[PDB]
A paper describes a structure:
In summary, we report the structures of Aβ filaments from a case of AD with the Arctic mutation and from mouse knock-in line AppNL−G−F. These findings have implications for our understanding of AD pathophysiology. Comparison of local conformations in this region revealed the presence of additional hydrogen bonds between adjacent Aβ molecules in mutant protofilaments; these hydrogen bonds cannot form in wild-type protofilaments, providing a plausible explanation for the increased fibrillogenesis of E22G Aβ. Mutation E22G may have an additional fibrillation-promoting effect, which is the relief of electrostatic repulsion as a result of removal of the negatively charged carboxylic group of E22; in the wild-type structure, E22 is trapped in close proximity to the carboxylic group of D23.
Filaments are made of two identical S-shaped mutant protofilaments that extend from D1 to G37 of Aβ. The N-terminal segment (residues D1–F19) is longer than in human Arctic folds A and B, allowing it to fold back on the common substructure and extend across the dimeric interface towards the other protofilament. In addition, there are salt bridges between E11 and K28, and close contacts of the side chains of H6 and S8 with the backbone atoms of G29 and K28, respectively.
Residue numbers in the entry:
A (entry chain B), B (entry chain B), C (entry chain B), D (entry chain A), E (entry chain A), F (entry chain A): 1 to 37
Write the structure that this text describes.
C-alpha cells in the first residue's frame, strides 16, 4: 500500500515600491527601468 | 490502497507602486518602463 | 481504494498604481510603458 | 535623429511524441501525464 | 543623434520523445510523468 | 551622440529522448519522471 504525499507549503509576501517582482524562466528581451535620450 | 495528495498551499501578496508583477516564462520582447527621444 | 486530492489553495492580492500585473507565458511583442518622439 | 530597432528573430521546432510543449507563466494546478487507481 | 538596437537572434530546435519542453515561470503544481497505484 | 547596442546572439539545439528541457524560474512542485506503487 504505497502512500505518497507532497506540500508546496505556506508563503506570504509584503512588498512596496517594487519595479518588478516574480519569476521569469527566460529573457531574450529588455526589462528596462527607464531610458532617456 | 495507494493514497496520494498534494497542496499548492496558502499565499498572500500586498503590493504598491509596482510597474510589473507576476510570472512570464519567455520574453523575446521589451518590457520597457519609459522611452524618450 | 486509491484516494487522490489536490488544492491550489487560498490567495489574495492588493495592488495600487501597477502598470501591468499577471501571467503571460510568451511575449514576442512589446509591453511598452510610454514612447515619445 | 533617434533610430531604434528590435527583432525577435527566426526560430524552428520539429517535435514528436511530446506529452507537453510550450511556455507557461504560472501553474497552481497539476499537469499530470497519467493517474491510475 | 542617439541610435539604439537589439536582436534576440536566431534559434533552432529539433527534438523527439520529449515528455516536456519549454520555459516555465513558477510551478506550485506537479508536472508528473506517470503515477500508478 | 550616444550610441548603444545589444545582441542576444545566435543559438542552436539538437536534442532527442530528453525527459525535460528548458529554463525554469521557481519549482515548489515535483517534476517527477515516474512513480510506481
Amino acid at each position: 500500500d504505497a502512500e505518497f504525499r507532497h506540500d508546496s507549503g505556506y508563503e506570504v509576501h509584503h512588498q512596496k515600491l517594487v519595479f518588478f517582482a516574480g519569476d521569469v524562466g527566460s529573457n531574450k528581451g529588455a526589462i528596462i527601468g527607464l531610458m532617456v535620450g
